[PDB]
Amino acid sequence: GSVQIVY
Amino acid sequence: GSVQIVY
Amino acid sequence: GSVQIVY
Amino acid sequence: GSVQIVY
Amino acid sequence: GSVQIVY
Amino acid sequence: GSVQIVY
Amino acid sequence: GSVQIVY
Amino acid sequence: GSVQIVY
Amino acid sequence: GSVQIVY
Amino acid sequence: GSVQIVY
Amino acid sequence: GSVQIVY
Amino acid sequence: GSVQIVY
Amino acid sequence: GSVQIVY
Amino acid sequence: GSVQIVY
Amino acid sequence: GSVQIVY
Amino acid sequence: CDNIKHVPGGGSVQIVYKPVC
Amino acid sequence: CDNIKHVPGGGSVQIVYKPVC
Amino acid sequence: CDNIKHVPGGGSVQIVYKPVC
Amino acid sequence: CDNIKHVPGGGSVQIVYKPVC
Amino acid sequence: CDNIKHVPGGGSVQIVYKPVC
Amino acid sequence: CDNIKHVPGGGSVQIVYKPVC
Amino acid sequence: CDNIKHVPGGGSVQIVYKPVC
Amino acid sequence: CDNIKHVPGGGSVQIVYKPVC
Amino acid sequence: CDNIKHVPGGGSVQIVYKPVC
Amino acid sequence: CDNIKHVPGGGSVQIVYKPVC
Amino acid sequence: CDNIKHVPGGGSVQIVYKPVC
Amino acid sequence: CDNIKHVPGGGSVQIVYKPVC
Amino acid sequence: CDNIKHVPGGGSVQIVYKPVC
Amino acid sequence: CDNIKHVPGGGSVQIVYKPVC
Amino acid sequence: CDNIKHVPGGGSVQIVYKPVC
Ligand SMILES: *Cc1cccc(C*)c1
Ligand SMILES: *Cc1cccc(C*)c1
Ligand SMILES: *Cc1cccc(C*)c1
Ligand SMILES: *Cc1cccc(C*)c1
Ligand SMILES: *Cc1cccc(C*)c1
Ligand SMILES: *Cc1cccc(C*)c1
Ligand SMILES: *Cc1cccc(C*)c1
Ligand SMILES: *Cc1cccc(C*)c1
Ligand SMILES: *Cc1cccc(C*)c1
Ligand SMILES: *Cc1cccc(C*)c1
Ligand SMILES: *Cc1cccc(C*)c1
Ligand SMILES: *Cc1cccc(C*)c1
Ligand SMILES: *Cc1cccc(C*)c1
Ligand SMILES: *Cc1cccc(C*)c1
Ligand SMILES: *Cc1cccc(C*)c1
């Protein structure tokens, strides 16, 4: 249940 | 149940 | 349940 | 449950 | 539960 | 002509 | 013409 | 024409 | 026309 | 036309 | 193509 | 193409 | 293309 | 393209 | 392109 | 709201919760 | 809100919670 | 809010919680 | 808020909590 | 707030908590 | 409002009164 | 408001009264 | 307001009254 | 307000009255 | 306000009255 | 928004852009 | 926003851009 | 915002950009 | 903001940019 | 801000840039 954000 | 966001 | 943010 | 931020 | 910030 | 409010 | 409020 | 407030 | 407030 | 406040 | 406003 | 405003 | 304002 | 303001 | 202000 | 005329001629209670006007 | 005329002719209670106007 | 005319002719209580105007 | 006319003709209590105007 | 006219004609209590104006 | 393209090719007057966007 | 392109090609008057954006 | 491009190509008057942004 | 590009190419008058940004 | 680019190419008058930024 | 119960039971990303509440 | 209960049970990212509450 | 209960049970990142509350 | 309960149970990063509260 | 309870149970980084409270 992790979160990864890339722009 | 992870979240991955790419723009 | 970690968080990783990359711009 | 760690946090990593990269700009 | 550590925090790492990189600019 | 009065007003009474109760909750 | 008075007002009374109670909670 | 008075006002009374009670909580 | 007075005002009375009670908490 | 007085004011009375009580907490 | 001018604009004129009067109140 | 001027603007004129009058109140 | 000037502007004129009058109140 | 000047501006004139009058109150 | 000048500015004139009058109160 | 414009030109509202609230004259109940008695007791008045107005309870408005998070309006967006 | 513009030109509001609040004249209840009695007791008045106005409770407004987080308005955005 | 502009041109508000609050004249209840009695007791007045105004409770406003975090307005954004 | 502009041109507010608060004349209750009696007792007045105004409680404003963290307004942003 | 501009041109506010606070004339309750009685007792007046104003409690303002952390306003940002 | 997004991606608005206001190019009247003349005089332009925009009067917006209390928008909530 | 985002990505607004105001290019009237003439005189421009913008009067905005109490926006909440 | 973001990425606003105000280029009237003439005279520009901006009157903004109590914005909350 | 971010990334505002104010280039009227003429006279510029900005009157801002009590902004809260 | 960030990254503001004020280049009217003429006369510039900025009147800001009690900003809260 | 009141009494919101956000319990996805996993990863949660909330991106809210200029809300007016 | 009142009584919000944010318990994702995992990773949480909240990005809120210029809210007006 | 009142009575917020932020308990993600993991990593938490809150990025809030120019809120007006 | 009142009665905020921030207990992520992990790593916490709060980046708040020019709040007006 | 009142009655804030910041107990992440881990690492905490708070970066606040020009708040107006
Ligand atoms: C008509 C009206 C009543 C209360 C609040 C608003 C914003 C408007
Ligand atoms: C009409 C009105 C009542 C209370 C608050 C606001 C912002 C507006
Ligand atoms: C109409 C009004 C009442 C209370 C507070 C505000 C900002 C506006
Ligand atoms: C109308 C008003 C009442 C109280 C506080 C503010 C900022 C505005
Ligand atoms: C209208 C008003 C009342 C109290 C405080 C402020 C900043 C404004
Ligand atoms: C589209 C638009 C025009 C003026 C003001 C707002 C908030 C939006
Ligand atoms: C689109 C827009 C015009 C003027 C003011 C605001 C807040 C937004
Ligand atoms: C778009 C905009 C114009 C003027 C003032 C604000 C806060 C925003
Ligand atoms: C966009 C803007 C213009 C003037 C003042 C502020 C705070 C913001
Ligand atoms: C954008 C801006 C103009 C003038 C004053 C402030 C605080 C902000
Ligand atoms: C329900 C809700 C989510 C995010 C922002 C607001 C103001 C409200
Ligand atoms: C519900 C909510 C989320 C983030 C910011 C605000 C002002 C409200
Ligand atoms: C709910 C909330 C989150 C962040 C900032 C504010 C002013 C409010
Ligand atoms: C809820 C909140 C978070 C950060 C800053 C402020 C002023 C408020
Ligand atoms: C809630 C809060 C956080 C940081 C700074 C201020 C003024 C307020």
Q: Three-state SS across chain U?
A: CECCEECCCCCEEEEEECCEC
CA distances from B7 to X2, AA16, AB16 (A): 21, 17, 19
Residues in Cβ contact with Z3 at an 8 Å cutoff, skipping those fewer than 6 apart: AA2, AA3, AA5
Q: What is the dihedral of CA I3, J1, J4, J5, to 10 degrees?
A: 50
Greatest Cα pair distance in chain N: 20
Q: Is residue H3 a contact partner of residue T13, using CB atoms and an 8 Å limit? A: no
Q: Measured between alpha carbons, how far is Z10 from B1 in angstroms, rounded to an integer?
A: 5
Q: Is residue X11 a contact partner of residue N2, using CB atoms and an 8 Å limit? A: yes
Q: Measured between alpha carbons, how far is X6 from K7 in angstroms, rounded to an integer?
A: 29
CA distances from T10 to J7, Q10, Q11, R1, R10 (A): 21, 15, 14, 24, 10
For AA1-21, b/e burial (b = at least 16 CB within 10 A) is bbebebbbbbbbbbbbbbbbb
Ligand nearest to the CA of X14: 9
Q: In Å, how far from its chain's centre is CA R17?
A: 12
Q: Measured between alpha carbons, how far is J7 from M4 in angstroms, rounded to an integer?
A: 57
Distance T21 CA to ligand 15 centre (A): 17
Residue whose C-alpha is closest to residue AA8's, from AC14, AC15, AC10 = AC10
Sign of the alpha-carbon dihedral angle for U7, U18, S4, Y21: negative
Q: Measured between alpha carbons, how far is Q12 from AD18 in angstroms, rounded to an integer?
A: 40
For Y1-21, b/e burial (b = at least 16 CB within 10 A) is eeeeeeebebbbbeeeeeeee
The DSSP line for Z1-21 is -BS-EE--SS-EEEEEES-B-
Q: Measured between alpha carbons, how far is AB20 from AC19 in angstroms, rounded to an integer?
A: 6
> Using CA positions, which residue lies closest to atom 1 of ligand 15?
AD1
A2:AA8 CB<8 A = no
* Cβ–ligand 13 contact at AB10 (below 6 Å): no
Greatest Cα pair distance in chain Q: 28
Please list every residue in chain E whose beta carbon sits closer than 8 Å to the beta carbon of residue AD11: 1-3
Q: Is residue T1 a contact partner of residue S21, using CB atoms and an 8 Å limit? A: yes
Q: Is residue J6 a contact partner of residue H6, using CB atoms and an 8 Å limit? A: no
Q: Measured between alpha carbons, how far is W21 from X15 in angstroms, rounded to an integer?
A: 16
Interface size F-Q, in CB pairs within 8 Å, comes to 5
Please list every residue in chain A whose beta carbon sits closer than 8 Å to the beta carbon of residue B7: 6-7
Q: Measured between alpha carbons, how far is H3 from G3 in angstroms, rounded to an integer?
A: 5
CA distances from Z15 to U13, Y10, AC10 (A): 35, 41, 21
Q: Measured between alpha carbons, how far is AC8 from AA9 in angstroms, rounded to an integer?
A: 9
Q: Measured between alpha carbons, how far is V16 from X16 in angstroms, rounded to an integer?
A: 10
Q: Is residue AB11 a contact partner of residue AD12, using CB atoms and an 8 Å limit? A: no
* Cβ–ligand 12 contact at AA1 (below 6 Å): yes
Binning chain P into helix, strand and coil, the percentages to the nearest 5 are: 0, 50, 50
Q: Is residue U7 a contact partner of residue U14, using CB atoms and an 8 Å limit? A: no
CA distances from AB3 to AA3, AA6, AC2 (A): 5, 11, 7
